[PDB]
Design an enzyme around this catalytic site. Structure first.
Site, PDB file in Angstrom:
ATOM      1  N   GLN A  68      77.806  29.256   3.561  1.00  0.00           N
ATOM      2  CA  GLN A  68      77.874  27.910   4.164  1.00  0.00           C
ATOM      3  C   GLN A  68      76.972  27.855   5.390  1.00  0.00           C
ATOM      4  O   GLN A  68      76.835  28.858   6.133  1.00  0.00           O
ATOM      5  CB  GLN A  68      79.326  27.569   4.516  1.00  0.00           C
ATOM      6  CG  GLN A  68      79.696  26.085   4.783  1.00  0.00           C
ATOM      7  CD  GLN A  68      81.170  25.955   5.116  1.00  0.00           C
ATOM      8  OE1 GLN A  68      81.943  26.739   4.661  1.00  0.00           O
ATOM      9  NE2 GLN A  68      81.542  24.970   5.889  1.00  0.00           N
ATOM     10  N   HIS A 231      90.320  25.243   6.037  1.00  0.00           N
ATOM     11  CA  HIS A 231      89.060  25.792   5.566  1.00  0.00           C
ATOM     12  C   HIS A 231      89.300  26.398   4.187  1.00  0.00           C
ATOM     13  O   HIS A 231      90.154  27.278   4.015  1.00  0.00           O
ATOM     14  CB  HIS A 231      88.556  26.833   6.572  1.00  0.00           C
ATOM     15  CG  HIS A 231      87.349  27.605   6.129  1.00  0.00           C
ATOM     16  ND1 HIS A 231      86.098  27.044   6.028  1.00  0.00           N
ATOM     17  CD2 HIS A 231      87.201  28.904   5.792  1.00  0.00           C
ATOM     18  CE1 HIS A 231      85.234  27.959   5.638  1.00  0.00           C
ATOM     19  NE2 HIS A 231      85.879  29.097   5.488  1.00  0.00           N
ATOM     20  N   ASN A 255      85.853  33.988   2.088  1.00  0.00           N
ATOM     21  CA  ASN A 255      85.426  32.930   3.022  1.00  0.00           C
ATOM     22  C   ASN A 255      83.979  32.405   2.671  1.00  0.00           C
ATOM     23  O   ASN A 255      83.018  33.169   2.688  1.00  0.00           O
ATOM     24  CB  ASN A 255      85.519  33.502   4.458  1.00  0.00           C
ATOM     25  CG  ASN A 255      85.107  32.529   5.500  1.00  0.00           C
ATOM     26  OD1 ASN A 255      84.625  31.468   5.184  1.00  0.00           O
ATOM     27  ND2 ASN A 255      85.330  32.864   6.750  1.00  0.00           N
ATOM     28  N   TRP A 257      81.739  31.019   4.223  1.00  0.00           N
ATOM     29  CA  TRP A 257      80.806  31.421   5.273  1.00  0.00           C
ATOM     30  C   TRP A 257      80.020  32.685   4.868  1.00  0.00           C
ATOM     31  O   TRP A 257      78.870  32.869   5.290  1.00  0.00           O
ATOM     32  CB  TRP A 257      81.567  31.682   6.592  1.00  0.00           C
ATOM     33  CG  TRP A 257      82.163  30.448   7.288  1.00  0.00           C
ATOM     34  CD1 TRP A 257      82.118  29.147   6.861  1.00  0.00           C
ATOM     35  CD2 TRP A 257      82.898  30.435   8.526  1.00  0.00           C
ATOM     36  NE1 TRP A 257      82.760  28.318   7.767  1.00  0.00           N
ATOM     37  CE2 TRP A 257      83.246  29.083   8.796  1.00  0.00           C
ATOM     38  CE3 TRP A 257      83.274  31.430   9.442  1.00  0.00           C
ATOM     39  CZ2 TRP A 257      83.980  28.708   9.926  1.00  0.00           C
ATOM     40  CZ3 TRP A 257      84.007  31.059  10.576  1.00  0.00           C
ATOM     41  CH2 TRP A 257      84.332  29.695  10.817  1.00  0.00           C
TER      42      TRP A 257
END
Ligand SMILES: [Ca+2]
Ligand SMILES: [Ca+2]
Ligand SMILES: [Ca+2]
Ligand SMILES: [Ca+2]
Ligand SMILES: [Ca+2]
Lengths: 310, 318
Positions: A68, A231, A255, A257
């Protein structure tokens, strides 16, 4: 046979460009502030301008490639990561015969799900950058652009990149393949949660989870054990190890990210030294990559919900 | 009982405000540029001169509901949330379900503290959302969703609670769903009107009587052609509600008719339109029943013109 979004045909448009000796500039999604949905010095750059030898796919189209950027599209991206584990359906959504050398005319196509059927979306490969770097979705491998382009494709079908942020689905992923979205209240879970998750992962289903908040200012905040709140995470696995004289259920999370939980069964955690050293080798990967294990007990305490897209 | 969005409890926040003698200001959805959006409603043309006003500042005696919570109360403002508004208009035909989404024990008189609540469908369950009643206004008027009755505010407030749940008003524009309406109650089915089923009329009729939500739209080949108006007054790339089917007797045969509603609240000009001559050629009672002569967004078509003009029918079975 997939519906051509706005009647754009990839093959005839690529040919037109190749024959003209031009690169595709999509008239239906200009490289303008309207595509962004809104931040100084954003310049649109093709991969062939950022790199001498850009690749579409390097080492396979995997969840490693899902990092991300400066956009709150966590749900979409956790969804794409989940999709990478179902290889056959990933490669419906992401056509594989796409690259930056053969027939390169600055044009790509993807297939999404909208209105009970497949929709093909055409894009040009201009991608938002700031400071020589991709602003939004990028791969761990900087020469790789399939996921940057896939995300632009979703943004196109959602009107702009900003419309990708904040929600629990996006245009092109609603009732994906005509399957049933199921949600599990992790505070009152079923007794057979482990099996339901294992079965879903085996079936090529898409699983994610989040932690609910009680304040808009707490959204995206990071816990004392390095979970991010409000999230979207990917559920990427489950395993059973023997720990302290009993079976011990583990769940693997990623995650979007691409960078983790610091509690029990985390990468450098001490519980891994109190199992069969063979299991530690197979499971305890020590990479700052967004992906980690938790116990299933710790999982239900920390998170609010499990979603399964069957 | 429904999950309270962000842990916000209507009844205790309302009493806190009454006991304080203030009006609720929602700390989790400030009456700010952020609650509006990012591009078509971000910082700087459609947002110039927006003043937030409670209905009590707009009107001397505001009402929540006036003569029912009905589809005539859904008029789209300067915001492309047509799918949502066609959904809500559709939902007004299912009374039991409409009044679970719109709690009826709310008003501007007794217990009024500038706070309202609505229940939506999110993550396989009902979610309750609290709002304050500060609504966007421009030139002395509501900017977004409004009723045909200017003193009525339930639908304006409803659309605000959807905006909150979706992050902002702009987030409600562009899509074929929104947070609070995805897979409504565990419910969606799509029919290609160019290759339609022989029994389409009966599929629609059953769905309408079930209290399902039905909708339709015309696809485009150009982004600039979105919201363009055809020579017969249809709007392209635009969510309509399907609100009725009938069979009348016309030229010696049974004629299948479908009723649509533009969520703008303002119509097809062709055969079976409001002032069309076909109506003068069916039974006079069925004409009085069915042919209402109001510029209100809602009109009849023959099922044959509907399949020729429109691209797709959605059925959300509840
Ligand atoms: Ca890769
Ligand atoms: Ca860490
Ligand atoms: Ca790791
Ligand atoms: Ca009314
Ligand atoms: Ca009318």
């Amino acid at each position: 046979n997939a519906l051509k979004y706005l009647g754009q045909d990839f093959k005839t448009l690529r040919q037109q460009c190749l024959d003209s000796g031009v690169l595709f500039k999509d008239p239906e999604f200009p490289a303008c502030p309207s595509a962004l949905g809104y931040t100084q010095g954003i310049i649109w750059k093709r991969p062939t301008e950022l790199c001498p030898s850009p690749q579409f796919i390097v080492g396979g189209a995997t969840r490693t490639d899902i990092c991300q950027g400066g956009l709150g599209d966590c749900w979409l991206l956790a969804a794409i990561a989940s999709l990478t584990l179902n290889e056959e359906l990933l490669y419906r959504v992401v056509p594989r015969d796409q690259d930056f050398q053969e027939n390169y005319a600055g044009i790509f196509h993807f297939q999404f799900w909208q209105y009970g059927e497949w929709v093909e979306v055409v894009i040009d490969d201009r991608l938002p950058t700031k400071n020589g770097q991709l602003l939004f979705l990028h791969s761990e491998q900087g020469n790789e652009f399939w996921s940057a382009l896939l995300e632009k494709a979703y943004a196109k079908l959602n009107g702009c990149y900003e419309a990708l942020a904040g929600g629990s689905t996006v245009e092109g992923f609603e009732d994906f393949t005509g399957g049933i979205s199921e949600f599990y209240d992790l505070k009152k879970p079923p007794a057979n949660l482990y099996q339901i998750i294992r079965k879903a992962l085996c079936a090529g289903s898409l699983l994610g989870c989040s932690i609910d908040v009680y304040s808009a200012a707490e959204a995206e905040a990071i816990t004392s054990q390095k979970l991010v709140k409000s999230h979207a995470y990917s559920v990427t696995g489950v395993e059973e190890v023997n720990f302290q004289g009993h079976p011990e259920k583990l769940i693997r999370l990623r995650n979007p990210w691409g960078e983790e939980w610091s509690g029990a069964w985390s990468d450098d955690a001490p519980e891994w030294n109190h199992i069969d050293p063979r299991r530690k080798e197979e499971l305890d990967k020590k990479v700052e990559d967004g992906e980690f294990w938790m116990s299933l007990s710790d999982f239900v305490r920390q998170f609010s919900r499990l979603e399964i897209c069957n």
